Amino acid sequence: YVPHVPYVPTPEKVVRRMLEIAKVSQDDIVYDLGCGDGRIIITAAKDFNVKKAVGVEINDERIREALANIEKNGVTGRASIVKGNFFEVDISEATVVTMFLLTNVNEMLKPKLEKELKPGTRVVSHEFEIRGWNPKEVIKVEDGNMNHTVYLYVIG
């Protein structure tokens, strides 16, 4: 089995602000690349009423959490998990893509996004500047003692 692996979730306030910044609404399909405990797709479904939210995650410890959290939050009808490497998972149906990634995956991520996402798709990232792209918005989010940066991109 896969042993314990540390992770970094996005604080709840930053999750909300990300979805606000991307103007997430009911008609949206939200994909979270590396969804961890599922909080972004759960909040999108629970608080922003999205028709569909899909979390992609490779770590089974995280997936087990996320699956339970979906039930605990009463959003099993609209939120789901895809087990896999998000580089290898089809995200083309997304109208909004969220990311909080702490490794240098920029060079790899850019071509998959341009290839699979339709023009007008919004990409919103927590402290992940996408090198070579021009952000529509760069927003500082104050979170108690903590500060965060959120980037918004619009495909095309």
Ligand SMILES: C[S@@+](CC[C@H](N)C(=O)[O-])C[C@H]1O[C@@H](n2cnc3c(N)ncnc32)[C@H](O)[C@@H]1O
């Ligand atoms: C920084 S945590 C963020 C979790 C969540 N999106 C949030 O903001 O609260 C990054 C997550 O991405 C997952 N991850 C990293 N690389 C991945 C990959 N290639 N495919 C799927 N998941 C990945 C990790 O296992 C971890 O759960």
Ligand SMILES: [Mg+2]
């Ligand atoms: Mg932060």
